[PDB]
Point group: C3
Amino acid sequence: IAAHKGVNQAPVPLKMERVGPHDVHIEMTAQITDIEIDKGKIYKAWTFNGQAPGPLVVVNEGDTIHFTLKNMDPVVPHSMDFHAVHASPSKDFIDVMPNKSGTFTYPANKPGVFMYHAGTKPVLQHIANGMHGVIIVKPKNGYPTDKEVDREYVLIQNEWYKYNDMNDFQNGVPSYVVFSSKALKPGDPNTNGDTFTLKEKPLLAKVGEKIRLYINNVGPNEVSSFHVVGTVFDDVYLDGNPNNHLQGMQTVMLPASGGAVVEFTVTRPGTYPIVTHQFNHAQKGAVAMLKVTETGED
Amino acid sequence: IAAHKGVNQAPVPLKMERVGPHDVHIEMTAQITDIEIDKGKIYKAWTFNGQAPGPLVVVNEGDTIHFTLKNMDPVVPHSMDFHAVHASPSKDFIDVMPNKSGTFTYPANKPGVFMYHAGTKPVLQHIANGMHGVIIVKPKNGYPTDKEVDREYVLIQNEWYKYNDMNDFQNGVPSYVVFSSKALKPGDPNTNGDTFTLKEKPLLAKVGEKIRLYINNVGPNEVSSFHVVGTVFDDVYLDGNPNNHLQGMQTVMLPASGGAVVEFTVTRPGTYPIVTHQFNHAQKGAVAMLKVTETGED
Amino acid sequence: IAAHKGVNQAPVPLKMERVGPHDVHIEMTAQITDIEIDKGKIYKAWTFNGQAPGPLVVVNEGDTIHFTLKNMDPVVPHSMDFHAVHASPSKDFIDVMPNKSGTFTYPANKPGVFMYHAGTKPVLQHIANGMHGVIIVKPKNGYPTDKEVDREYVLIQNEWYKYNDMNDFQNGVPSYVVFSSKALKPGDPNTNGDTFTLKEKPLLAKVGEKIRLYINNVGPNEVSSFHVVGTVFDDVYLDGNPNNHLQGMQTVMLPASGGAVVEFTVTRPGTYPIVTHQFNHAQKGAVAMLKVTETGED
Ligand SMILES: [Cu+2]
Ligand SMILES: [Cu+2]
Ligand SMILES: [Cu+2]
Ligand SMILES: [Cu+2]
Ligand SMILES: [Cu+2]
Ligand SMILES: [Cu+2]
Ligand SMILES: [Cu+2]
Ligand SMILES: [Cu+2]
Ligand SMILES: [Cu+2]
Ligand SMILES: [Cu+2]
Ligand SMILES: [Cu+2]
Ligand SMILES: [Cu+2]
């Protein structure tokens, strides 16, 4: 795209504020931002807010979201689809033109770990170029295992293909498959989907802790066989709904866009790989690390 | 196949009749029929009854099926395997020769949404050429959410490959991935697996309705990440068995041959896409549309 | 690998012995062994004990495993990762050098059907070359359907690629996808992952029996759509945990490394194919046979 040559729009912080007991404002951008997806490999990504996957959104079950998208892309329209919400796609997930803004309002009435992404045709093109992310909806009644959890993080899996190549997007194997982590609390890492950051700067935990991960596989195209090496998942909630409760799973199958809340105990000090057990994808980047110490600090 | 050159056997209606409180007769054909799978693209499909996927079969839990296959193919033997039934495959799923008929009897003792397909070696060849379909077995006790459902439809996902190309069937990506709908009640659409019909003539519903879809991914080769845009599944019954109950899923993973009953509410007027969220497959045709109006008519 | 030319190390029996009410010793080898994966096709596999998948391990819930790996490979280090155990991967799943042994101890505190495999970087290379297997952990309280089961077997699905070809391992379709069976009781077959043995020498059962299969899809790369032709699964326990209970499934989705306990009834004499319903993989070898007779013997 000629109008994208040399364009590298600096990341813009997500804006969110509560405006009522059950109403939340969210303002995001669509923007074109260079991301290092593998060492020495820059992808001029189509992004929300200059991150790919986009920034983490967290709301409460029953919140109505008043969402504004500011399209900074000079030529390509973009839109937003939240899997959390009940909305009319042809009225509420519509395109925002370059240099314009649009505001859309819809309720998040289901708890869980939901994908969000651009919904502009061809959707495959917008997702593959980087316009994906996660919104977490916190259950009103929590999860039955809340009291057991010591520490929590968010992980997202995505693929990267040849740059803006629709033939490759449809018909080719992914060039990279990657994990990223998005911050829930101050001090948490906030990273982009790349092959290396969560290996070189592992997530941190303490010996004996029960860890919760909020996870989603945004695709665009692959399913995920999510596994933490050296442990077993004590409890799994499919899509993050507290009713979809499994126990003692070694590996959790996630469809494309599929989410889960998974919980596991780390019993010994060491470094614990986190993989998709589809090992062609792991080899192409989809390995993160969890470093477990006696004190919890690196 | 030389004996298939110029052959286009007109579709023959499914024949079914109840013969006892727990016994049902079903008569189907195997036939060679041209189907437009994408605009301008004719596939000379191997079919049951001139449809691909084949005609919908609905029976009651506990029905014994007395099934007759009339093979109209001039040269290729075909057979029938119903996933619903308990049968001896080497006695009851056997080949029927060209221009012959065979009758086989077996019970459907489990509720759900089951694949059926030809079971003639190489099975991949018969399925990929179009010999797949769905049989629904209605639960004796229903589903716990029956009283909430306002409207229902059947959707089937399948792939199409290069014509009768076993190398492509085994080793290549699908050329098209498609949805079709099969009629449950008079007035429902009844379509074949193509890239366009359910976009141009969407399924219809009314604002506020809870919709049930009986779904199955017949493959032959891909798994499906089934998702309705703009809603969340309130309830999901894996394989259509009422015991396999999930709630609040954004997306339902279906193995090849996997089925489900999914239920969701459409809260606003508009058009709601229905996809496999493996977006390479969606881009290659696997998007249907649900049009929701204030009155339910187009 | 030059040091592997002409190397064909004869299979070595698994060594196991109980050393306390909750402690079990296991001794395995890493060795280089020629396996006929398809008729006329020898793969010089990287193996545990000269089998691929490796020998079956069965322990009780709550057993601590004292595991020794003797590395017979002349040049390549190998390691062991059991999905059953809680361990520090960077301390307990570490490499054993050629011609050395290492001993590692860790508890199996969860019931189920778990993958094991080499954990040496690049893990994809070690798994794809054949270093995978299953460990079964028997639940302390059993399964609720134990009293209904008449006969049981273990089945494992794996893929084979071009020989030691990392490009193919990461980016290519599998050349073969295969089932193998591992013995639980004297007289059970014990086979390697190949395209033919379980077709030519089917598993055996008697008319009317309820069969339990302990299954795992070790990959490395594909998911599995596990289906027994001519029946429906009465009960399914995902990953073999008794709590993850589904009923009446036609087909069970298994992620890469995913396991299950599945149970089904064979009502009539005949031969029942066992497949992954991803039929490209079935065509490339992933069909086993179950022969059901009036007397249960061939
Ligand atoms: Cu507002
Ligand atoms: Cu976009
Ligand atoms: Cu979506
Ligand atoms: Cu704790
Ligand atoms: Cu009859
Ligand atoms: Cu056929
Ligand atoms: Cu089948
Ligand atoms: Cu209603
Ligand atoms: Cu010991
Ligand atoms: Cu190895
Ligand atoms: Cu593993
Ligand atoms: Cu019995």
